[PDB]
Write a protein that binds this DNA or RNA. Sequence first.
RNA 1: GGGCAGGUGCCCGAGCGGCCAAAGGGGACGGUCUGUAAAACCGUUGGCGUAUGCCUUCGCUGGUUCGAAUCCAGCCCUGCCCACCA
RNA 2: GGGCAGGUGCCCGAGCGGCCAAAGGGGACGGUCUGUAAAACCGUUGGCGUAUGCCUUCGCUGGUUCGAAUCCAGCCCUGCCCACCA
Lengths: 425, 425
Amino acid sequence: GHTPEEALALLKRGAEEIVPEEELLAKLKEGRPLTVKLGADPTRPDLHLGHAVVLRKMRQFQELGHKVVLIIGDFTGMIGDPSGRRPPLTLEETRENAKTYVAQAGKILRQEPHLFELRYNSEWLEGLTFKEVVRLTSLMTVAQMLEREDFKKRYEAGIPISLHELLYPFAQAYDSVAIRADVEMGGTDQRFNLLVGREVQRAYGQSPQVCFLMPLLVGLDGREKMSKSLDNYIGLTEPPEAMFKKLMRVPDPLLPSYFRLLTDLEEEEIEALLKAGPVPAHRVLARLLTAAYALPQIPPRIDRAFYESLGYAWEAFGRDKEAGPEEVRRAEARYDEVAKGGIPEEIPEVTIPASELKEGRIWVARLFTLAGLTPSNAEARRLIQNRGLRLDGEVLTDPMLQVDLSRPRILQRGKDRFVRVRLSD
Amino acid sequence: GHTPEEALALLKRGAEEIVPEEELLAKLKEGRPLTVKLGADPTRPDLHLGHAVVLRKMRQFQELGHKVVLIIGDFTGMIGDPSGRRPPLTLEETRENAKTYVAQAGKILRQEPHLFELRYNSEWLEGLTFKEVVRLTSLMTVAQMLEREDFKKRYEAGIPISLHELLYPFAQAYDSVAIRADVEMGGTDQRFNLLVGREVQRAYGQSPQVCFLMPLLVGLDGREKMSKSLDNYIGLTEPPEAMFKKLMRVPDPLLPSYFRLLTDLEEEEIEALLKAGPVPAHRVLARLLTAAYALPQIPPRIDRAFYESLGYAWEAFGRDKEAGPEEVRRAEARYDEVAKGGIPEEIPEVTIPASELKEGRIWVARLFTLAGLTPSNAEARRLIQNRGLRLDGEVLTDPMLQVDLSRPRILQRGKDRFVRVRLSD
RNA sequence: GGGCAGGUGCCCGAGCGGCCAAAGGGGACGGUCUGUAAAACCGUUGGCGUAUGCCUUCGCUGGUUCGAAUCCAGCCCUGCCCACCA
RNA sequence: GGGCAGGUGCCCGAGCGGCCAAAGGGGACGGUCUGUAAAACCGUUGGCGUAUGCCUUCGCUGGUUCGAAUCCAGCCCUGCCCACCA
Ligand SMILES: [Mg+2]
Ligand SMILES: [Mg+2]
Ligand SMILES: [Mg+2]
Ligand SMILES: [Mg+2]
C-alpha cells in the first residue's frame, strides 16, 4: 500500500543516514522483497531499548514486505580475542546465547520465513580459504583501514591493535556477499564496516548494499549511549513494573529522541505531549513502551492509535492513570506510591535461615547484605551514614542496630528497592 | 669430523648474524641433522652470485650432515599482488619456474634426499582455514608489524601498503611450523620475517628456529645489491667466457667480500692475493668461480686446494694464464685479447636475409639493430657520434655509411660485444 | 559514503598554454686515460632510410584551443582530510 | 633478536620507602529540595560481628627493609626506539 517514494519517506524517519539514499529508492522501485542484513554478536544476547532502535526499523522494513536476514556472528563469537590485549564462547554457549538473542529480537521482528531468516556466519566463514582471505584483504590498504576512528585513535595513542582486528571488517563484509544483502542495518558506530561491505560486494560483482544507519539511543544517565556495561539501560524483557519506573526517569532532554527512536508518534503529537510538561510526557512514553514490551511482540505501529487501543485518552495527556492494561496501571500506581514515600503492595521476599542469627538477632548491616540489598556490610554501614537505608519505613540512624526478626521486616535501600525478610529454620 | 664448536665456527664465517647464536650451538650438540629452511620465490627463478651467498652456506650445512628443505613459494607466487598497486603465475608457469630454480640451485646444493627435500608451500597453505588465519594474525599488533622498515617507510611517506602484505609474514612463518625448521636462512633483508617465524613457532609449541642471516652481495656497479632488475649481476648459468669477464670487472673494493662470500679461501690467502695487486686478485677470483660454476656442481670447498686441482699454482698469483680447464683458459685469453683491442676467435654469427638490403647495401645504423647490438637505429646513430661502434675493427665516424655485405662483416658495440653478419637469401 | 590533492622519461621529481622528449639531482650507456677497474673530463639517455619532415609521448577516455604534460569534463588507483568516535 | 619505558582503585591517571585503600579530574552511589528529573549543596566510592584490631590490596613470582604501590631480580603483555633498509 505504499509507492516506493512513500516507503522511502517512512523509512527515512528516525534515521541518521541512508547511504546512498538514491540507491535505496532504486531498490524500492524494483518491487521485490529487499534483503535487509543485521549482524548480531552472540556474546551480548540481552537486548535493551538501544538495540530496539535498529530492530524496530527492521520491523518497518518487514511491514513493507522486505526480508530480514539476522546473521549470528558465531564465527568471531567462538574466536573472540585470541590474544587477550571477552572470552571465547563454546559451541554450546553460542547456540544458547543465539537462542536468547532471537527470543528477545522476536519481541520486535516478524518471524514469518518470507520476512525473516536466521543464519550463522560460521556456515560460510569456516570454509573461507587462505587464498580467498588474502584476496579479500587486498581490497584495502593499511592507511585506508587505519582511518577507522578506533584504529586511528589507538594507533596514535600507543594502545595496541591486534592485527586480527583488521580482518574482522572483511569477515563482516563477506557476510554481505554470502547473503546478497540489499541493505545493511547498523548504528552510526558501524558506519565504517558497513562501507567495507559495499567495497567487498563490488569486488564480488554484486550490487553494493545500502548502508542504513540509526542514531544510538542515550542511556538513563543522559550522556552516554545506552549499553549493558554502563548500567544505564532498559532491557526489553524487564518486568513492566521496572520498565515503567526506568522510563519515568529518562532525563527530560532525551524525551524527543525516545519518542522518535522508540515510537511512531507524529512530530505534532510529540510536541503536544512536551507542551503538557515533562511528567505528563513521561507517563505517556512509559505507558506506550511498557505496554508494547509487555506483549509477546510489539505492534506494527507504536502510535497514537495504539495508545488509545490500550484504553488511554490522548487528550488526557497522562492524567488518566486508571486506564490501561492491568500490568501497566499497576506499574504506574507503584511508581506514584513509592514516590510519595509509601511501601508497595508486593515486594520481593527473602527467607533467612535461623543459622544466620546471633544472640537471636541480626546486625542490620549484615541483614541488608543477606537480603541482597547491599554487596557488603561495609557498604550497608556507609549507606546508613548517608541515610540511604530504611527499616519498616523508618530511616536507619544506628549502624550497630541488631534487628529482631520474630516477625517479617521491610528493608529499603534508596528510593525504590524493597525486600521483606522473614526467618525460616 | 667436527665437534659442535668446530661446526659453529665454520658456519659463522661470512655470516652477518646467527640469532640466537647460542641456540645454534645447542642444536648442533644434539648430534642430529638439523632442518635448514630456505624459501624461494618461483617468480624469480634465475639465480646469480648474490643468491649463491646463502645457497653456499646451505651447502656447508649439508656437508656437515644437515638437511635443506627448499620451499617453493608457489602459494604467494600464484596470488601475487591481487590489487596491482609482478603478475600471478599460472600453475604451469609455477612448476616450470620451480624446475628452473631447482636446476640452478643444484649447481650449489647437494641433492641426496637425506640432505635435501623440495616442498611447495601450497601443500599446507592452501588448506589453512580462516579461523586459523585469524589466530595466526593475532600474534602481532599493528604497531609491531609496521616496524618492518618497508612498512614504516611507506606508511610515513604516504606510499600504499596493501593489507594482504601484512599476511605474508605469517604465511612464511607458518612454513617454518609446517616443516619444523631448526634454522631459517636469509639475506639480512629478510631478518624481520625470519623473526616472525620464531614467534609463530613458539605459538605452535615448537622450538623457535635459529635465524641465519647472510650479507647481500654488491653488484658490478659497486653500490647496489646484486639483483636481476638492476642489471648488475653474474648469473650462475652464464657461459664461462662471460662469467670470467664480468668477474674481472668487479670493482676493487668488493674483492674482499667476493672472496669471503663466494669462496672458502682463508683470510691469510685472501690478503696475499690482494697484496699481489687488484688485477692478479681478479684473475684468481675469476678462475676459481668460473671453474666452479662451469662444473655441474660446485665442489664442497672453493679453496686453495681446489684452485691447485684446476692446474693453477697459488704462488704464481695469477701469472700462470696458460693453466686451468680449457673453458677457463679460453675465457681468460679472450678477455686479454679483447682488452688489447683484438677481435676474438669465435664471435656470434647473425645471418641477415637479402630482403633487408636497400640499393644492395644496409645503412650501418639499421645493420646494428638487425644484428641485435642496438635496440634502435637512433641509438646506433648516437653510439656512432660517441665512437662506440666499430666495423672490421675501425671506429665508425660516418652515421650515413651504407655497408656492403658481399662478404661477412665484423660489428662491435662498446668494448666486447661482437657480431659477425653475413647475407643469406 | 563526502572533500581536496596527486599519478610525468631508467628512478626521484619540476613543469603554472607555444620556449617540452620535458628543469634539477641520481642512475645507466659511449669515449678518452688505462687495469675491459675507479677517478676526472667530454658526450648520450622516444621511434622512423632522405628529416625544413612523419609517427608516438606525461594514469584512462573524451573536450576547449591554431596549439594541452599544463586548462575543462567523466572515470581508475593512491595519499591526506572528513564521516564513524559514547 | 637488542634497548628503554609502562601496567595502580569504577575509568583516566598521580605516587619519587612510612604521611597510601592510594593526588587530581571524571563517573557512579546515598541524601536534601522535588517531578523517584536536572541543577546546587553535603556525604560515599577494598573486606571482616566488638575494631587501639585482623585479612587482602597497585601485571606475575620472588627478594632488601622494622616497613615496598615506591627500591632490586626473574618473568608476562604492551608502547616507543633499535635491528632489517640496496
Ligand atoms: Mg573515503
Ligand atoms: Mg573516496
Ligand atoms: Mg623488539
Ligand atoms: Mg622485545
